[PDB]
Design a protein around this nucleic acid. Sequence first.
RNA 1: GACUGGAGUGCAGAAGAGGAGAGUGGAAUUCCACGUGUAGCGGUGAAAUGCGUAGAUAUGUGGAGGAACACCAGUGGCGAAGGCGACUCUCUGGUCUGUAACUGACGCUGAGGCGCGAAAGCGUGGGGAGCAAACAGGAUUAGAUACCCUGGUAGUCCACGCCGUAAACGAUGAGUGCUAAGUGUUAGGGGGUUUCCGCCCCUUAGUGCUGCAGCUAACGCAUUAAGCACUCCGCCUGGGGAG
Lengths: 62, 114, 93, 86
Amino acid sequence: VCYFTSNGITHIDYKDVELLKKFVSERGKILPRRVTGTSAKYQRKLTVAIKRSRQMALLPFV
Amino acid sequence: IESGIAHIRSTFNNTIVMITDTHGNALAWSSAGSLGFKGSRKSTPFAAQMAAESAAKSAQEHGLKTLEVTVKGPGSGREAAIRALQAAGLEVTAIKDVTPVPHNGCRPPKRRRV
Amino acid sequence: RKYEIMYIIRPNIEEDEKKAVVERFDGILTENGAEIIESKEWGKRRLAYEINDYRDGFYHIVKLNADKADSINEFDRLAKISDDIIRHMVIKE
Amino acid sequence: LTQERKNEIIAEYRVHDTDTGSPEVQIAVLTAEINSLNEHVRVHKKDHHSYRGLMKMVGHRRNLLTYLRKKDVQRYRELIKRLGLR
RNA sequence: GACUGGAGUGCAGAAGAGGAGAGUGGAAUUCCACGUGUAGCGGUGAAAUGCGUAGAUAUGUGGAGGAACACCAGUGGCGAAGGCGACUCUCUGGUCUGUAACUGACGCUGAGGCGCGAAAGCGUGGGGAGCAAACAGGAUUAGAUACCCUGGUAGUCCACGCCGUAAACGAUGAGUGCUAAGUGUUAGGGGGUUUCCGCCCCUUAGUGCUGCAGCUAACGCAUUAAGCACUCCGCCUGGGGAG
Ligand SMILES: [K+]
Ligand SMILES: [K+]
Ligand SMILES: [Mg+2]
């Protein structure tokens, strides 16, 4: 069951580090749909958000 | 004098094992070639163990009880080398990876028989 | 068009210096064809990795409206050229 | 091409106050779009994917234009000088 | 002359690695300097050529340079095709869904033309880290103008302009309609139920799997037909010579 689709929260923001940190590994890697329970649309959107955060140094690479 | 870091470079050809200080100055090293091997026998877990043991029992020049170990490459001798460093009489504190992975940067050379 | 901006100011800056830099980039945005509706801070928070010997930094926000984007472009080049902004980003809503 | 400008240029050439689906309206809006894209191409000459849609607009315009010519010729000889064709 | 199921505009939404430009990030290969540092490293089926006490290999720090962008990432998205994967902004194209507002057949194809068009390659000027045709050396071999190893120039990258080929392939031309199902998956809409959530069913455009009829020489295609029919274009008429 997807978080965002089950909760109706459609927007994702690259600044909610506390909520995006649930989906990066300890080594800094995004995780797949089957492991995170997400859906396709929101998983694209989480990729975009995570990458913007990483490039703002808000999340790490490693 | 109390703790060191071990760097093992294990490959499908040879195994190097270097003991250094935590801020990166060499104290000792060894390999299968300095151990006395000459061919594919370099690439073996036995050579890995023996070079590890020689390295550690020279590292007991300035002394230590503890190691953090860092493993590089696909060489099969990492298990034997880590067992060597545990069983020589040192408390290996943790194992870690130095897999030099590029995120699709510079390309490899060609495959074989092409 | 609704524009959002974020940026990071370095740690070695006192409060007067820092507010001067903030106000200066705000002036550069609003003196052009744009009007800052809001500009904000999180705080001197920890960077996920080190850009320089620096590892802390001042996270700031600017919510904005604009049509020309020369504000965006001057802000971008001037913030890269200044020794105070190590990071900034601009996004269209 | 913005909505407001689009509304302007449909309502100022609409044949009557309800209409926004006439060939007059379409040909006008297309001439706006193709001129903006001519500028776009003269800047970014090698965006051939954009040049594709350009030529599709031009073709649709010519199609509407021939239909109008066949339908009522006065509308045609009006629009050409009202818009800048030919 | 008239009408709206085709075609298109409007209106409300949704996705997207669709394209061009400019800038930007860190991994990571190499190189430069400096410490620590001692005799090997590399590679193979074995080796050897080669690098190394004028000090490597590695290890840490800092700096330079360019090329491509892990995870996400998936018979998933988009595009006419080629093809398009790091991020942001600007300029742009096209698609789908719903409405029945607007025009009222405005359409389908499309010879001859016009443009685009992987990689290699060509001209001019840069850049050139890696990989690497050619080439050199070492092995191999009966021989080896090769596979194999160590090096390595053109190139690969960029700007501009040519070249216009491809196993350029779904080896399957574009368009329209009709003719059983089951099931994933993507982007939407509608309705029943329920506290949203969640489940269910119906429907639109895609994308895939398996299958009925029917077709096929068979393999197999099967609402993404290679079925049933109509329009249009291109092409074939034994192999080779001969593209
Ligand atoms: K060239
Ligand atoms: K292809
Ligand atoms: Mg080329």
